[PDB]
Amino acid sequence: NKITPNLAEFAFSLYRQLAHQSNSTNIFFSPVSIATAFAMLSLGTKADTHDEILEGLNFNLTEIPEAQIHEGFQELLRTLNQPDSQLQLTTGNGLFLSEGLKLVDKFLEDVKKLYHSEAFTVNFGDTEEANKQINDYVEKGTQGKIVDLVKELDRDTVFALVNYIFFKGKWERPFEVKDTEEEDFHVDQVTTVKVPMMKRLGMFNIQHSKKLSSWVLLMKYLGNATAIFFLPDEGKLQHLENELTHDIITKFLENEDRRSASLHLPKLSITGTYDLKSVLGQLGITKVFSNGADLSGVTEEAPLKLSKAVHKAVLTIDEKGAAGAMFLEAIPMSIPPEVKFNKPFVFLMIEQNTKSPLFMGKVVNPTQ
């Protein structure tokens, strides 16, 4: 897991930029899927174009050899795509290139073999049909979950990247649907809205963190992932966002102690759609999107730039997800603390093998 600290730093850098853009929107993105997509893209780039990409993913190229970078990503892809995965994690990256380009066979091999991704040739001279084929690929890859992803291409487009991911996890210790009820969600300190709220009395990996001024809940999925929910104390959301570090996360993941709690957690159906050109440009990745791009590993003779790059992540949290593991947790008599995720909170999903940050986000209003 040599690249996990870099991915964690990329997650935070990406998160802190989005939360600065808008402070009143649900955030949800996949640090892993975005970083995978552009590490794969870097294989077709050279010189500064290449270096800007890996540095933008929080890799110090003076310290970590590039072979270890791509080895880390491909080992991460090996665990996420096990055929016997209960993770129910659907992700894909599509490269759409102008059919008039002479593509380097080495790049297409690396994309399909090393990164298990997809590359398509399209006639960008028909800009509305190229857009349809891009949206059809995402809709077919998500079996109808993500529809009409790309809303507009510009006529000069010759190279587009789409990165999607959809997660519906199954809780190892599930909630009962009968106990889900409508509850208040404090969008601010004087305002509430009603949302469907799951609840369960059980033995939770849960603690209050002085450092973060937050409650910290860890719940395991069926499969190889854990969800971490951060509930900030009153007026402490910005403090929580500032203080998150990879080492603080690791200590939480090492704790296996359990205490009783009456947990209230909203059902969630949230999506995030991001312009990676704009977003990753703020993180230093710009030349690959500019006329000066060195994409000579993709095509040798003709000029090329990445004209379009979109990321869409979809999350569903509910009670269960297809029956009968039958865990019995023993609940002590004492009064269990009431931990209600009924105000803005942050969350992070972690791949259990690599400790990689599969997702990160913030819920400011479950029914936005």
Curated annotation (Swiss-Prot):
Recorded consequence of changing residue 125 to R: In V and M-Nichinan
Where it sits in the cell: the answer is: Secreted; Endoplasmic reticulum
Carrying S-cysteinyl cysteine, the residues are: 209
Q: What is the effect of changing residue 125 to W?
A: In M2-Obernburg
Q: What happens when you mutate residue 333 to V?
A: Oxidation-resistant inhibitor of therapeutic importance
Q: Which residues carry this modification: Phosphoserine?
A: 334
Q: What is the effect of changing residue 133 to E?
A: In L-Frankfurt
Q: Which UniProt keywords apply?
A: Acute phase, Blood coagulation, Endoplasmic reticulum, Extracellular matrix, Glycoprotein, Hemostasis, Phosphoprotein, Protease inhibitor, Secreted, Serine protease inhibitor, Signal
Biological process GO terms, please?
acute-phase response; blood coagulation
Question: What GO cellular-component annotations does this UniProt entry give?
Answer: collagen-containing extracellular matrix; COPII-coated ER to Golgi transport vesicle; endoplasmic reticulum; endoplasmic reticulum lumen; endoplasmic reticulum-Golgi intermediate compartment membrane; extracellular exosome; extracellular region; extracellular space
What's the miscellaneous note?
A: The aberrant form is found in the plasma of chronic smokers, and persists after smoking is ceased. It can still be found ten years after smoking has ceased.
Query: Its biological function?
Result: Inhibitor of serine proteases. Its primary target is elastase, but it also has a moderate affinity for plasmin and thrombin. Irreversibly inhibits trypsin, chymotrypsin and plasminogen activator. The aberrant form inhibits insulin-induced NO synthesis in platelets, decreases coagulation time and has proteolytic activity against insulin and plasmin.
**Associated disorder:** Alpha-1-antitrypsin deficiency: A disorder whose most common manifestation is emphysema, which becomes evident by the third to fourth decade. A less common manifestation of the deficiency is liver disease, which occurs in children and adults, and may result in cirrhosis and liver failure. Environmental factors, particularly cigarette smoking, greatly increase the risk of emphysema at an earlier age.
- Subunit structure and binding partners: Interacts with CELA2A. Interacts with ERGIC3 and LMAN1/ERGIC53. Interacts with PRSS1/trypsin. Interacts with PRSS1/Trypsin. The variants S and Z interact with CANX and PDIA3.
> What name does UniProt use for this protein?
Alpha-1-antitrypsin
Q: Which organism is it from?
A: Homo sapiens
